[PDB]
Amino acid sequence: MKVRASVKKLCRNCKIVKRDGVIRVICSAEPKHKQRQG
Amino acid sequence: KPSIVAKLEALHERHEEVQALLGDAQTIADQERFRALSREYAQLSDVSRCFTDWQQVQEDIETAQMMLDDPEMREMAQDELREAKEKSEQLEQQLQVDDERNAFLEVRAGTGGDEAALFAGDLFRMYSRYAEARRWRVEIMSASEGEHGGYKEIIAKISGDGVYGRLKFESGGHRVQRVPATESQGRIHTSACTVAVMPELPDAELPDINPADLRIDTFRSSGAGGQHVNTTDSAIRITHLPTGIVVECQDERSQHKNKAKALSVLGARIHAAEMAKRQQAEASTRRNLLGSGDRSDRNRTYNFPQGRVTDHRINLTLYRLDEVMEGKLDMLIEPIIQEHQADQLAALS
Amino acid sequence: VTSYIGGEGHNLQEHSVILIRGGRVKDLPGVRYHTVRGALDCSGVKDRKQARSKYGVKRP
């Protein structure tokens, strides 16, 4: 989980989702690719 | 080839052993050992193949001679000439195979005094002629003339392609036995000279003042300054994390001037420490390479009464001193390099 | 003290116990004793067929 001001898709399995007004990235392949915008 | 044949026999035996060692699946499980053996196999295989060819040709030469009737001159002659050609190819191919940089050559007098200077001059002339008849370049940086004859110490730089790889075996002591010029009577005298050959290496220095590895402390100076020295942080201190040096400055009333001065002093101290380290390392290396001219520690001997030049490292004597003193010492350095290479292959365990 | 190792070739090195006796080597300044060959950790001169008992070599 990386907290940064710019979250991007890093592989082909990454998905952009918005939960409670926070844009975050989740992918099923690599757990290193999950981020939160903050 | 009296002694090098033993080295090549041992090399062939080790090649066979390492060949066998690669087919048991018990030493192949680990990877570092497998890679080491694989790297060791190549040169061993090539040199062993050539040596076995030479050995079989030699054994054929030994036989087919102890008989009569037929005129066996032609086949024996062709076989021995082809054997000599193959031997020359073998020696050259395992002698060549990096390190070909320029070099510093310095020779100084040892025992003898005024005649060791003359021998040093003669030896320098030999090396200079050798360099000149190689399309190299020799230039003199330091010279100390020796009163009567040559130089008490000469330091010159030789520049070319392949310099250090051929002049690295001349570092040591050279003994001369002859009748000196500064001799009233007709006595024979023994003297020596010391030779040092050192490779050329760069002087890469960098501004190791990267602020990412510095600790900076700012505090109050101590002294008489009134009510302004109390409520101000004018004194500075810099600590260098890698080396560990600390420099503190509170000279002037301005913090920026103190910071600049202390930073400059820290840089100067780092530079001085590094230069001292390099200087002591070079001095120790030169001391170990040079020896101590005492006509008892030596690498080669020159006898002018007999006209014989001999090399004690490989036990090789030759009676062509007049050619050697004329910069034709390629007939002296090649036998050494050969013996210096069979060890390198043999030192793989 | 300093001791002299006689004979051609020795197997001595640092951290080896030896037996020494009297006897001065003249042209060596400071040497005043001699190492007894054939003693605890020094072996006799290899291929020595004369004056064997002085260098601790067994009779072949």
Partner: protein, 130 residues
């Protein structure tokens, strides 16, 4: 094998006697390679060596440290009938030895090295004495 070295080199008597008085009863064997000068120490397995070291430290008061050494198996070679044995004792002079009982020994370095070095030099190499 695990050659020996003790801390104080002058209190070396008790390790030189506590190892001839304890190889007299079949607990240890003391090779001594020809070229260098070591005190390599045989054993048939781990437990016998453990017994040797504990006994040698307790009974005789020898404080030592035992480095490892790369050797697979020893073999007692004894074939003096011919002359080629004399040259074998020279070509392979690097890795021979001398027991307590002065029998030679071809201290090998692997099964492959030994299996080669008795394919040539066709003399006898057995592994038992006495």
């Amino acid at each position: 094998f695990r050659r020996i070295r003790l801390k104080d080199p002058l209190k070396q008597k008790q390790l030189l006697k506590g190892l001839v008085q304890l190889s007299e009863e079949g607990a240890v064997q003391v090779f001594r390679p020809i070229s260098n000068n070591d005190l390599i120490v045989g054993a048939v397995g781990v437990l016998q060596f453990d017994v040797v070291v504990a006994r040698l430290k307790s009974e005789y008061n020898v404080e030592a440290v035992y480095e490892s050494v790369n050797v697979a198996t020893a073999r007692w070679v004894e074939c003096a009938d011919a002359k080629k044995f004399e040259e074998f004792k020279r070509k392979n002079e690097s890795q021979l030895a001398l027991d307590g009982g002065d029998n030679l020994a071809y201290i090998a370095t692997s099964m492959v090295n030994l299996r080669l070095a008795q394919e040539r030099y066709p003399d006898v190499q057995f592994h038992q004495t006495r």
